[PDB]
Amino acid sequence: KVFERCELARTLKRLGMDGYRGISLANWMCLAKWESGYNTRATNYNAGDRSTDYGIFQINSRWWCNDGKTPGAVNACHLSCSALLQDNIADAVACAKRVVRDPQGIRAWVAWRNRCQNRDVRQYVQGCGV
């Protein structure tokens, strides 16, 4: 499913992401925009280390979800990677909460450091009534 911007903002709000480990909703919205363009079906295979990034947050199969074909997989979210390609994002959100409980927090996603850190990200939630 490709979410509309404010549709996603209200869904993340309902799922308890606003201020989760000190991370505002606008920061989570900036991350989903640049990771997938708010598309739950997004996958990206990384040929160099043989891992794939899944779903709206592009969560990686080496560390977080299990797809059975990645070398060294840890599966810290204890989730099948197919659970991150659903239209329903409650599982992708429970795994994203797990990722940021590590000390790096949202910095775990490089795309957040490149496109969202130290920028004004408030336009991602403006007008959504969130």
DSSP state of 60: E
Location of structure tokens 């599966």 = 75
- Say how far apart CA 65 and CA 77 lie, in whole Å: 6
- What's the resolution in A? 1.7
- Say how far apart CA 46 and CA 71 lie, in whole Å: 12
Number of domains in the chain: 1
DSSP state of 39: B
Return the CATH number at 87: 1.10.530.10
Structural domain of residue 112, as residue ranges? 1-130
- Say how far apart CA 101 and CA 24 lie, in whole Å: 15
Using left for φ > 0, alpha for ψ between -120 and 50, and beta otherwise, residue 110 falls in alpha
Catalytic residues: 35, 53
Identify the experimental approach. Answer: X-ray
